[PDB]
DNA sequence: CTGCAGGGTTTTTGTACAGCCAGACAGTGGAGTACTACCACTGTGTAAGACAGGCCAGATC
């Protein structure tokens, strides 16, 4: 298999050069894709022509470190 | 024992010089900021009307 093939042949190489593996982590993505999930239920315009167009509004609204750092509030 | 009344007794309560400043009253000219109903759009539930086919009556096999 292809990934048993990655982790006995190739981990060392690219660990070796590129700093750091998991570093990069597709993993980000597709976990956080269940806010496109829940994007959609919620704050839906609701027509196609719109619902991308708001979905991406609100999405990297919650995405922007600015009202993270305001979510936080001193801890 | 009881009820009632002069005063006590301490607390509470308002009236009392005396000066100071927060807080409000008018309005001005309209911005403007908050509010309230369109509004474009389809997803979801709904229930009137097709309808068919199953059944009884008419009449038959
Ligand atoms: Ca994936």
Sequence with gaps: ????????????????????????????????????????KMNARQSKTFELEDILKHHWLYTSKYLQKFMEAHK
């Design 1 to 40: 298999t292809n990934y048993l093939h990655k982790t006995l042949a190739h981990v060392p190489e690219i660990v070796e050069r590129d700093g750091s593996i998991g570093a990069w982590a597709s993993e980000g993505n597709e976990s956080g894709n269940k806010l496109f999930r829940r994007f959609r």
